[PDB]
Design a protein around this ligand. Sequence first.
Ligand code: HEM
Ligand code: HEM
Ligand SMILES: [Ca+2]
Ligand SMILES: [Fe+3]
Length: 712
Amino acid sequence: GQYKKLWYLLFAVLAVCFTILGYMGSEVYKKPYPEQVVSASGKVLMAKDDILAGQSAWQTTGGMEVGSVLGHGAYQAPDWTADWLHRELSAWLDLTAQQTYGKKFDEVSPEEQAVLKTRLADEYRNQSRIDGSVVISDTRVKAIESILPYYYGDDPNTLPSQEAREKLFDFFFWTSWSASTNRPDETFTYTNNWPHEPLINNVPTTENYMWSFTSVVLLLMGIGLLMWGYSFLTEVEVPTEDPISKVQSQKALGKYVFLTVALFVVQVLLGGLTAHYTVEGQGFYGIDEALGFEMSDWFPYALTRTWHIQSAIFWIATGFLTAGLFLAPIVNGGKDPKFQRAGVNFLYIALFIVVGGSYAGNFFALTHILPPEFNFWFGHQGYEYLDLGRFWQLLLMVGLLLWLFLMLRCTVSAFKEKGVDKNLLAIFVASMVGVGVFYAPGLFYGEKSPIAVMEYWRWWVVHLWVEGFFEVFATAAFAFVFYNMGFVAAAAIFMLGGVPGTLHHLYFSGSTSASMAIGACFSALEVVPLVLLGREAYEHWSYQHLSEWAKRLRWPLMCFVAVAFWNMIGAGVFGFLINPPISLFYIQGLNTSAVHAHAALFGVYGFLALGFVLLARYLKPNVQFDDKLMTWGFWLLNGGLVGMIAISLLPVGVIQAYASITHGLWYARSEEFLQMEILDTLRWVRTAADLIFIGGAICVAIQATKIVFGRD
Ligand code: HEM
Ligand code: HEM
Ligand SMILES: [Ca+2]
Ligand SMILES: [Fe+3]
């Protein structure tokens, strides 16, 4: 502890962000599942048993990777919490159709519809829950009896006194009731008025459009303070004074990248088959005819959706762990422990079986060829990005512990070398610890558990362990590599902004006001680091006239300019578009967020993983590596990306947003809406950009494939 204040710099922001996220985490752990709901007379229709068994069955079926609830999943099949609330609203429109109005929704004229939607609105929004029991009217009993026949188009001894399937729809009805009931002390719902159901009065409250602009005010405060702080005005070379970049376990690391790019290509095959599944889900041009039945049984949309997301995970994950363990032998200085290649291959094949087995379990449970107890563990887990079973999550994190074991083994010498408590060999070994550990948050998670805590612990990995990795490990690797070649804060600001801001997805899943405010504030503060690359991009544009024949690093800068470009675009200006509750209320679970997904995953981290696979370059000479396939890959991947985020997702997304604004979210998700001429033909011409993007993935894939003929 020579200069422990520099440790206290990170310790402070980390302790305050872990206090904020941990205690607002205690707030979303505290602030339900009624033991048994009853009728006005007495009879039961649902129990905690049925809601949690229907949750377990929901997680068995894997409906979260095909039909969204609370906005959190896939966007092919309609939202089974908005659609349920609308179908139950149609049930209340069918029920009271006796006295002061006609039969249908719009059969009664707007003049007399004024006396209609007041009675039901003041039926269930009044607190109807004590004793773990929800008490409901015989009206609501006949409603919950009325709604079930609706649940086609093109969308996927004695003990109890209910069915099993019944438990699923009881869990759906639970999501509906929990979504459409006011809080204690407050006049808004547990979901903060979600979903957008107009006829029950569900729209953002005061805090939403207060903090929506307070976030803008805080962001402009930050921008202003830095920009006016920049007034005082407080290089490794002059014009032409750069040195040459030359240095000569990694036999097996060459296969990690082949795995990586093959998984990237099949990830885009599942992306493309998910693309075709959103055009026609009744057949496949002969082989899957309604008489025949071939493709729809074995490899459905659920499977393409889970496997597209598990491939995106695994190809980028191997795409960075390969770089971690490829740059490992430079950290200690070649200091190889006993049987290191064998351990790296052990880890490699553990990754292989985790990868295969995980989405093979999804194969088995998503087609339901599996018991109840055997789902979740082996089968589909039921959650976006944790689609992989728990067996395989535990095994993946054991792969992360063998990786952190091997990386810590490959930095024991670096840990012995550093006398300074906050050295590069302390930050780049804090980052690897921050990676190899923080997938563990994802395991504090069970099928029979409450869902708020579950998703809290989900975005605790999917927007925390992803963000405290590519902006922390990759950057201390950047410093390390640019130090070792002779070329030469973000972590602290991005883990002060990003760690407590990760709650920006959790506004409409049971969060208190403090969590909304914190989320809003710190998600607003997530922009000011990502916008710093807005000048760094221009600086690059006015610095990239340097490398010639001798300089090996030519095209990776053309990767990284795009990385910074899309890192300004996809998250900074596209994430803060959706950050406000006023827009996220409606946007939550539309094609709008596919733009942010494809543009912030492949747009930022995909090209980064590709750049790190290309960092290939220390096994081939400077003037012998071929680079037409590089430009091919760039033009095709970026043209396909900008194509798929411009031609399709922007217009469909904004159309969907306007439809959600006007007719309602449930309508914006309904098949009557989602099968318009415009939208069907737009989803039909989405595949052009997909062809080009797959072409681009194939180009850079065949580059790294054909790298293997003449290597160093
Ligand atoms: C040719 C390549 C690709 C095609 C054709 C493709 C196509 C698709 C399609 C059609 C969807 C369905 C969206 C929906 O209706 O819900 C999807 C979802 C998704 N894709 Fe891709 N994709 C490709 C590559 C990628 C890559 C390389 C990444 C990331 C590295 C990526 C990340 C995602 C994510 C995250 C989602 C889901 C978003 C969510 O569930 O909320 N895709 N993809
Ligand atoms: C590299 C950085 C980032 C990545 C990889 C990323 C990734 C993602 C992904 C995949 C989703 C889709 C979740 C789902 O549909 O279930 C998402 C949602 C979202 N992200 Fe990000 N994000 C990043 C940065 C940001 C930033 C900086 C902001 C705000 C300034 C932001 C705001 C949002 C919002 C508001 C949503 C909600 C969309 C929805 O639930 O449908 N993100 N993010
Ligand atoms: Ca999603
Ligand atoms: Fe996020």
